Amino acid sequence: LPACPEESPLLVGPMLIEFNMPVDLELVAKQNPNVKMGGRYAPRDCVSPHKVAIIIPFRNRQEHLKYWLYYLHPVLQRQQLDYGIYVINQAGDTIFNRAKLLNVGFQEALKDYDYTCFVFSDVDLIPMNDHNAYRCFSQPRHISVAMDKFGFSLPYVQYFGGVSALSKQQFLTINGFPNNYWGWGGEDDDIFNRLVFRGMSISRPNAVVGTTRHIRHSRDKKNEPNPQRFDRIAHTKETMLSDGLNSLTYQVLDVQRYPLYTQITVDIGTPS
Ligand SMILES: CC(=O)N[C@H]1[C@H](O[C@@H]2[C@@H](O[C@@H]3[C@H](O)[C@H](O)O[C@H](CO)[C@H]3O)O[C@H](CO)[C@@H](O)[C@@H]2O)O[C@H](CO)[C@@H](O)[C@@H]1O
Numbered sequence: 325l326p327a328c329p330e331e332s333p334l335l336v337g338p339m340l341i342e343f344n345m346p347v348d349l350e351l352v353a354k355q356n357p358n359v360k361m362g363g364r365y366a367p368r369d370c371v372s373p374h375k376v377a378i379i380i381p382f383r384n385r386q387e388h389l390k391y392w393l394y395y396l397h398p399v400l401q402r403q404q405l406d407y408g409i410y411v412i413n414q415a416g417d418t419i420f421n422r423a424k425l426l427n428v429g430f431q432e433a434l435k436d437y438d439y440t441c442f443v444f445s446d447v448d449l450i451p452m453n454d455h456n457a458y459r460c461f462s463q464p465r466h467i468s469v470a471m472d473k474f475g476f477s478l479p480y481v482q483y484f485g486g487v488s489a490l491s492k493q494q495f496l497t498i499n500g501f502p503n504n505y506w507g508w509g510g511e512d513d514d515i516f517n518r519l520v521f522r523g524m525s526i527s528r529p530n531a532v533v534g535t536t537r538h539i540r541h542s543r544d545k546k547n548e549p550n551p552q553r554f555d556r557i558a559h560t561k562e563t564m565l566s567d568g569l570n571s572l573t574y575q576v577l578d579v580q581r582y583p584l585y586t587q588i589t590v591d592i593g594t595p596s
């Protein structure tokens with residue numbers, strides 16, 4: 325098979341995104357016949373250079389996940405990606421750890437396939453334009469750049485939250501993400517710091533192409549704003565040296581291969 329074209333010729337650009345209707349995953353699976361068990365897809369007519377594992381930090385967000393799958397699967401296929409969806413479900417009911425789950429996703433997805441690109445996406449963010457590539461570039465890529473909840477612009481120029489893509493080497497270079505940001509906030513800023521401290525800069529699509537919708541939701545319990553976050557982001561340069569992939573442990577309790585995604589339920593513990 326020849327290589328897929330550098331830019332997909334299948335894209336349609338701007339899309340209409342709605343979250344006001346029920347979603348039936350069995351139906352979504354039917355509308356996406358080429359997506360195989362575990363939520364895996366690769367074009368059958370050409371070889372994609374983008375081997376992407378899409379990692380979603382998760383707990384009690386099934387409804388949001390249905391909308392995510394409904395919208396992203398058609399988009400990822402049009403982008404001609406060789407991809408897999410991984411929902412990292414945090415076991416238990418103790419304080420949430422978004423970034424540690426993302427590290428779990430990276431390490432566990434690599435056991436499935438030789439992925440060389442990682443998209444880290446919150447479960448409630450949907451792209452409004454398929455020209456917004458869900459794959460990696462020569463520099464870390466910030467994808468959800470113009471979110472409606474931020475008035476369709478970046479909240480601040482160093483904002484790197486929501487959805488991003490790091491190549492395998494970029495991720496390894498920064499020793500992955502921090503494992504000690506328990507509760508809401510700051511971990512995305514820490515990741516931004518890591519990239520900068522390793523000589524990288526943030527690549528971004530323009531604001532129109534990067535328009536993204538956030539599914540309005542209320543505060544989840546067990547993920548209260550971390551009071552130590554401002555302090556932690558000020559010491560990233562030093563802490564990234566020993567806190568991340570090289571200090572990660574966890575226990576996978578279960579791996580479920582659904583038609584549209586693989587769900588890894590994992591025990592990531594509590595603060596130490
Ligand atoms: C650290 C953190 O909470 N980051 C989230 C981010 O919040 C921003 C943060 O800005 C701080 C102010 O600029 C202050 O003057 O100085 C400290 C120095 O470390 C900055 O970190 O906090 C304010 C107030 O809470 C917030 O309005 C800023 O947006 O917001 C992101 C979007 O919600 C979130 O993803 C980051 O994790």
Ligand SMILES: NCCCCCCOP(=O)(O)OP(=O)(O)OC[C@H]1O[C@@H](n2ccc(=O)[nH]c2=O)[C@H](O)[C@@H]1O
Binds near residue numbers: 380381420422446508
């Ligand atoms: N109107 C009240 C404002 C609600 C503020 C709650 C903070 O909202 P956001 O900054 O969007 O963060 P969030 O959506 O709660 O967390 C980000 C991501 O973590 C994941 N997440 C977080 C908490 C939780 O219980 N379960 C879960 O899956 C999910 O992928 C989510 O999209």
Ligand SMILES: [Mn+2]
Binds near residue numbers: 446448538541
């Ligand atoms: Mn949210």
